[PDB]
Design a protein around this nucleic acid. Structure first.
Ligand SMILES: [Mg+2]
Ligand SMILES: [Mg+2]
Ligand SMILES: [Mg+2]
Ligand SMILES: [Mg+2]
Ligand SMILES: [Mg+2]
Ligand SMILES: [Mg+2]
Ligand SMILES: [Mg+2]
Ligand SMILES: [Mg+2]
Ligand SMILES: [Mg+2]
Ligand SMILES: [Mg+2]
Ligand SMILES: [Mg+2]
Ligand SMILES: [Mg+2]
Ligand SMILES: [Mg+2]
Ligand SMILES: [Mg+2]
Ligand SMILES: [Mg+2]
Ligand SMILES: [Mg+2]
Ligand SMILES: [Mg+2]
Ligand SMILES: [Mg+2]
Ligand SMILES: [Mg+2]
Ligand SMILES: [Mg+2]
Ligand SMILES: [Mg+2]
Ligand SMILES: [Mg+2]
Ligand SMILES: [Mg+2]
Ligand SMILES: [Mg+2]
Ligand SMILES: [Mg+2]
Ligand SMILES: [Mg+2]
Ligand SMILES: [Mg+2]
Ligand SMILES: [Mg+2]
Ligand SMILES: [Mg+2]
Ligand SMILES: [Mg+2]
Lengths: 88, 103, 117, 66, 70, 271
RNA sequence: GCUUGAGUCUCGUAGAGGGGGGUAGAAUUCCAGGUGUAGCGGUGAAAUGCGUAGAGAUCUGGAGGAAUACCGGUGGCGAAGGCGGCCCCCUGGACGAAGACUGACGCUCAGGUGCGAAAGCGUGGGGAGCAAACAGGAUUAGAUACCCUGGUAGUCCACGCCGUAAACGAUGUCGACUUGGAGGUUGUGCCCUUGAGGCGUGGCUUCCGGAGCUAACGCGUUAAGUCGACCGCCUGGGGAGUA
RNA sequence: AAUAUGCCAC
């Protein structure tokens, strides 16, 4: 659960329009922000398996969106992974 | 900034020290920038069951808009303060500024 | 020897025996009687008549304290909840309070395993 | 004979109103079932929560005999 | 289940009122329930069975209301 | 960190070592060291009083402050250090007036932590207060038995003493042995357990690891000869004796406390 | 290219969903003491056991562990295993209304990886109650059982491992279509909230039953009906899920 | 409360 202001910042810094909340890079950036936030939580709650399942679901959704972006428009994918610091 | 409802019941012998408790607690919250939204002293009420063999105690209600941090220092305050015989702090959906049903 | 006037009668009626104890209002026991001590073994030890006899015997054993009225506190699920109080009032104490004080854990420990007779 | 809280529009049973809370506890301090009291399920859950909080705050007994 | 014998309340009616207060509290039912430990599987099974039999009885009741016997 | 070793050799096969990485790797603080010569278990008569002691690595005594006298002056934990003289680790702290000192390291302490002693000290781990000010139900360490004498109870690694009650000028404590002892209310104590709680998980793995700590071999009594030990003697592996110390006192279960001077401070034995 | 699949955002919603920390009262047990006597406890009867060294009962004050009466509901949440006192911190999912956004980004899944009741194992703790093992009493032809009286591991915690259950709605996941009725629970809209009313619409869930299907029993819009996609699995019984 | 068993074509 990202804060509403954090979601707004991510949309504003990754999408063409401030109302562009469904763009592929917007979705991937939201997923990456939440995963980075949750890493610290799961460093201290190793036995929170039910939450870890939702984290893994976000991981897989981000992977699917990244594959879609890569096989569609490659340059956007490369710029996105550059701005997000994802290895692949 | 989360809305909290703090109810703490004080040893009757310290009925005179309760105003000092309230002043220092509200000072702490306002210094932490949190706003007290409601505050009412139930006075000394009889107890539905004895606590530490005490049958009466001095109830204090206060609704605040304090950061969770300063709420935690008030938690430790109630813990290590031997006069506050029982405390309960609750998250509320919104601030409550009305009048409590016991007024 | 000591005069108490106002006493409390604890009845403890389990499925097998009834213990009736008269105390002052401080828990200091003044006397007691049991269905097993009233001459009942086994099949008969846990019957309302046995509880009645035990209560009568306890009432007579606590006579010289001059007890006039009794609180009554009942514990357990046994048959000796009914005839015991009847026998107390028939003995003559003014029964002013009847309370059930049966322990009911608010969960509590784990009861013994269920029998398979 | 229905749920008084949904008859009144109140959506939370505030635990500080022992005058209302008493209506829904037996004299032995137990909570009265929703079947008996006619309260709908949501307000029965809210009511049980409020009763438990009041019992913690000693505004209600956990039981009659203490 | 605490009662107070009031003014001009005879013993028999005081005992009767105490009996009804004890039954209203249901204490003996809980004590006979707690005498032994019954597994959670047994608790769930017998709760489901009691509910099933109640539903079947009420359906049979308001179905046989529409049945003539003699 | 409890790190098992690898069985690269029979002496290393079973070795388990607690490698704390926060420990200072430099040399200890010089102005608080002292000479500490070994004894071998020999007293001033030169006879072996305590057997099975001798050898071992040379060590230097670290003047650890068990009194926490400097009260009212906050002290910041400069660093944590390895003390050879004890199971626990020590902590070089530095007061605001420029004095450095060593303290027993409580659990969860790090470099940069603030600690304080005195009546008005904040009731937080690492701090030192008298027990009439420490809340009941607390867990403490470095407990004093006489006011101002210095800490003596719960100083080993990972131990702690629970303040279970307060009765007037006394307070009742539960010690690690299970004993229930009365201690004057003005005896100081320090909050929290003692650090290095993993110390008991280390396995020495070989005889040399014991010898490095000055623990000489322990001959079983039954291997001796009847002139040497009550258990000695026998054509074969014989016994038939009730197990006794080398000096004839029964050694299994025969209680030996006899201090009626302090029997009045024991509320309950450890049995 | 498009949007009706899929997904994101905005507002709220209900919940024993999870992890961490604290605390509350009831109760059993034990310890110290007071009153107080000869029984208690147990059973189908009985005895072992407890008790005149003063039990049981009753009262006071402590200690400690475990589980959360009533609410409680073929109620709720969860992918499953499962989860129920209260409070706080971190956190996952579902759902509804209106709009905007992306534009097939989807469904399934061999091998792989994760989770996975209980019992069990390793280390360190803890240990009230219950209780395999065990011992005694009884029952019996015998009774290494049921019953009784005690009782250890273990149930509890931290971490690690096991990876199995009648792990079951014995019913793989996803999607579409095909008469109903009575509920339960959770939102949302209209009016009249004109008496908590009706009138719709969503989500999940329980019972009965229609066509159809089934060997029958039965399932029956939450299909075992009519179809599509992918995967798993079966080929007489025993041997054997064993070597 | 205890109440074990039933081999000779059909
Ligand atoms: Mg039994
Ligand atoms: Mg010398
Ligand atoms: Mg030695
Ligand atoms: Mg040795
Ligand atoms: Mg020998
Ligand atoms: Mg020899
Ligand atoms: Mg010699
Ligand atoms: Mg010698
Ligand atoms: Mg000799
Ligand atoms: Mg020899
Ligand atoms: Mg020899
Ligand atoms: Mg030999
Ligand atoms: Mg021999
Ligand atoms: Mg597979
Ligand atoms: Mg287990
Ligand atoms: Mg084993
Ligand atoms: Mg184990
Ligand atoms: Mg163990
Ligand atoms: Mg034990
Ligand atoms: Mg036996
Ligand atoms: Mg047994
Ligand atoms: Mg299987
Ligand atoms: Mg199951
Ligand atoms: Mg099932
Ligand atoms: Mg199966
Ligand atoms: Mg799948
Ligand atoms: Mg569901
Ligand atoms: Mg059907
Ligand atoms: Mg079929
Ligand atoms: Mg096999």
């Amino acid at each position: 659960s990202l804060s509403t202001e954090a979601t707004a910042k991510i949309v504003s810094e990754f999408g063409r329009d401030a109302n562009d909340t469904g763009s592929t890079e917007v979705q991937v950036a939201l997923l990456t922000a939440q995963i980075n936030h949750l890493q610290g939580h799961f460093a201290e709650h190793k036995k929170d398996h039910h939450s870890r399942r939702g984290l893994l679901r976000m991981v897989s959704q981000r992977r699917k969106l990244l594959d879609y972006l890569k096989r569609k428009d490659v340059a956007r994918y490369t710029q996105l992974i550059e701005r997000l610091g994802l290895r692949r | 900034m989360r809305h909290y409802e703090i109810v703490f019941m004080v040893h009757p012998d310290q009925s005179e020290q309760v105003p000092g408790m309230i002043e220092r607690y509200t000072a702490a919250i306002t210094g932490a920038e949190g706003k007290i939204h409601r505050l009412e002293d139930w006075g000394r009420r009889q107890l539905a069951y004895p606590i530490n063999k005490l049958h009466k105690a001095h109830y204090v209600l206060m609704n605040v808009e304090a950061p969770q941090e300063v709420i935690d220092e008030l938690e430790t305050t109630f813990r290590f303060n031997d006069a506050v015989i029982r405390s309960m702090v609750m998250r509320t959906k919104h601030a409550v500024t009305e009048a409590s049903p016991m007024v | 020897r000591k005069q108490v006037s106002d006493g409390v009668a604890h009845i403890h009626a389990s499925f097998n025996n009834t213990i009736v104890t008269i105390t002052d209002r401080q828990g200091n026991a003044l006397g007691w009687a049991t269905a097993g001590g009233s001459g009942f073994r086994g099949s008969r030890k846990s019957t309302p008549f046995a509880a009645q006899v035990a209560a009568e015997r306890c009432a007579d054993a606590v006579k010289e304290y001059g007890i006039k009225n009794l609180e009554v506190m009942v514990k357990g699920p046994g048959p000796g909840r009914e005839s015991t109080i009847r026998a107390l009032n028939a003995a003559g104490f003014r029964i002013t309070n009847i309370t059930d004080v049966t322990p009911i854990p608010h969960x509590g420990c784990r009861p013994p395993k269920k029998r398979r007779v | 004979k229905f749920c008084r809280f949904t008859a009144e529009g109140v959506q939370e049973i505030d635990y500080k109103d022992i005058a209302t809370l008493k209506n829904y506890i037996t004299e032995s301090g137990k909570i009265v079932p929703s079947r008996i009291t006619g309260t709908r399920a949501k307000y029965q859950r809210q009511l049980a929560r409020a009763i438990k909080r009041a019992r913690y705050l000693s505004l209600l007994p956990y039981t009659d005999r203490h | 289940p605490v009662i107070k014998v009031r003014e001009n309340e005879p013993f028999d009616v005081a005992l009767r009122r105490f009996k009804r207060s004890c039954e209203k509290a249901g204490v003996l039912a809980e004590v006979r329930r707690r005498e032994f430990y019954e597994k959670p599987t047994t608790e769930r099974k017998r709760a489901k069975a009691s509910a099933v039999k109640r539903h079947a009885k009420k359906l049979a009741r308001e179905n046989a209301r529409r049945t003539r016997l003699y | 960190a409890v790190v098992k070793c690898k069985p690269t050799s029979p002496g290393r096969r079973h070795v388990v070592k607690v490698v704390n990485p926060e420990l200072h790797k430099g040399k200890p603080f010089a102005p608080l060291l002292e000479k500490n010569s070994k004894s071998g278990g020999r007293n001033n008569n030169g006879r072996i009083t305590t057997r099975h002691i001798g050898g071992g690595h040379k060590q230097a005594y670290r003047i650890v402050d068990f009194k926490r006298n400097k009260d009212g002056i906050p002290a910041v934990v400069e660093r944590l250090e390895y003390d050879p003289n004890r199971s626990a680790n020590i902590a070089l702290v530095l007061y605001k007036d420029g004095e450095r000192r060593y303290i027993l390291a409580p659990k969860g302490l790090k470099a940069g932590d603030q600690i304080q002693s005195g009546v008005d000290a904040a009731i937080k781990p690492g701090n030192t207060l008298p027990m009439r000010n420490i809340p009941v139900g607390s867990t403490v360490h470095n407990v004093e038995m006489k006011p101002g004498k210095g800490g003596q109870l719960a100083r080993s690694a990972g131990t702690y003493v629970q303040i279970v009650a307060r009765d007037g000028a006394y307070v009742t404590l539960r010690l690690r042995s299970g004993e229930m002892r009365k201690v004057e209310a003005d005896c100081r104590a320090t909050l929290g357990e003692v650090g290095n709680a993993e110390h008991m998980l280390r396995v020495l793995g070989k005889a040399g690891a014991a010898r490095w700590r000055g623990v000489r071999p322990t001959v079983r009594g039954t291997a001796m000869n009847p002139v040497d030990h009550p258990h000695g003697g026998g054509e074969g592996r014989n016994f038939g004796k009730h197990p006794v110390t080398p000096w004839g006192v029964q050694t299994k279960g025969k209680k030996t406390r006899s201090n009626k001077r302090t029997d009045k401070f024991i509320v309950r034995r450890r049995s």
